[PDB]
């Protein structure tokens, strides 16, 4: 409603929503730490 038809610039719209952008990026920007992966693998005739 505000950026497509009204004409508000995209840059100004995100100026007041910096924390929203940062929170969304941190969700997919973090990784788990190293750990022995093959030790946890248990094969558990087939």
């Amino acid at each position: 409603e505000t950026v497509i038809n009204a004409g508000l610039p995209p840059s100004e719209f995100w100026s007041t929503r910096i924390p929203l952008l940062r929170a969304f990026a941190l969700s997919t920007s973090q990784k788990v730490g190293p750990y022995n992966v093959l030790s946890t693998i248990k094969p558990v005739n087939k």
Binding site: A23, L26, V32, Y35
Partner: protein, 355 residues
């Protein structure tokens, strides 16, 4: 000696409360609550389990935190599957945080914890915080190990650079990194790492964190903050709120742009001006002029009256069951002393005494 043992224990407890100096405390705060939800929290040491009890006390802590710090902000983070998950943004609404905590109560904790991921997320949430607010993180750690993708030491240095403060509440025993994180971040103090010894101690630890943290002398951030005191209005017809865009019968009116808000204290969604009431500021006056502790009066000297000055309770006839205030020199009963320094924050004798 059994009764004497209790009294000396009370005296020892009062000893820590005798040294009450008017320390400069940061009333405006910005807290990040990092809770641990990992495999280590599935133990049964805390009935029913660590996850359930911590969440329940967290909800109570949220209620107390905003009641005594109405102009502060809080955020909540959880450590799950080796990653930091955000469940509540920094905001002054106590209901949003409670709602997030209740939802977390259902999901089972699993995976490994990661202090670095939680701390890195905290560093980001606190980045858009004014310089007059105290950036604080209250981590509730439950594991004895930390799996991180990078160097935790680098993050600790970064936190010190941003003037962030960390409080860690462990569960089982001391952890070397947590001690360093709390020590290198609190200007060398080692009293910010607390390990509970039972459920009762846990309740006290959360309740202790509610009070504002005294600031350091070399950390100066003095300034003037532009605030506003709106006037409540009573409208016959519902009107659209400027914060949630819904129909609400009432709401406050901002004095800078006349835009209405639903609840206080919150920053105006139009002029970004903090809106508060005189009561919100009055709630924190007792943190700037703490009442001087009452000293037990020895039985050797004579007393003024047989009954309490405030509650008119007959003093029980060894030890004098009277507490006197040096400012006004009026005896008080043991019951009044507790209520005058915890619920009330003004000595009735001092107010009654003319000057």
């Amino acid at each position: 000696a059994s009764l004497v043992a209790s009294i000396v224990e009370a005296r020892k407890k009062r000893t820590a409360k005798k040294n009450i100096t008017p320390y400069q405390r940061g009333i405006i705060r910005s807290l990040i609550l990092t809770l641990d939800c990992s495999e280590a929290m599935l133990e049964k040491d805390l009935r029913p389990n660590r996850h359930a009890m911590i969440i329940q006390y967290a909800i109570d802590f949220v209620h107390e935190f905003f009641d005594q710090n109405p102009i502060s902000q809080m955020g909540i983070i959880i450590m799950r599957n080796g990653l930091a998950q955000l469940v509540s943004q920094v905001s002054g609404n106590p209901q949003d945080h409670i709602d997030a905590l209740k939802s977390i109560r259902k999901q089972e904790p699993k995976g490994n914890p990661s202090l670095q991921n939680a701390l890195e997320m905290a560093r980001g949430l606190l980045l858009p915080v004014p310089a007059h607010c105290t950036r604080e993180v209250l981590i509730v750690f439950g594991s004895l190990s930390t799996t991180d993708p990078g160097d935790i030491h680098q993050t600790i240095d970064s936190l010190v650079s941003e003037k962030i403060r960390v409080k860690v509440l462990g569960l089982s025993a001391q952890v070397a990194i947590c001690k360093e994180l709390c020590k290198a971040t609190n200007y060398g103090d080692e009293s910010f790492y607390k390990i509970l010894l039972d459920e009762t101690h846990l309740k006290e630890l959360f309740n202790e964190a509610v009070t504002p943290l005294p600031v350091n002398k070399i950390n100066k951030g003095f300034t003037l903050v532009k605030m506003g005191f709106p006037t409540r209005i009573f409208e016959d017809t519902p009107t659209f709120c400027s914060c949630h865009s819904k129909l609400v019968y009432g709401g406050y009116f901002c004095p800078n742009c006349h835009s209405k808000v639903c609840s206080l204290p919150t920053v105006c969604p139009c002029c970004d001006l903090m809106l508060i009431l005189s009561t919100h500021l009055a709630r924190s006056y007792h943190h700037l002029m703490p009442l001087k502790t009452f000293a037990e009066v020895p039985t050797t000297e004579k007393f003024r009256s047989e009954d309490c000055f405030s509650c008119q309770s007959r003093f029980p006839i060894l030890t004098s069951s009277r507490y006197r205030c040096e400012d006004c020199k009026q005896e008080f009963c043991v019951d009044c002393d507790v209520f005058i320094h915890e619920i009330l924050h003004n000595c009735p004798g001092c107010e009654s005494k003319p000057v």
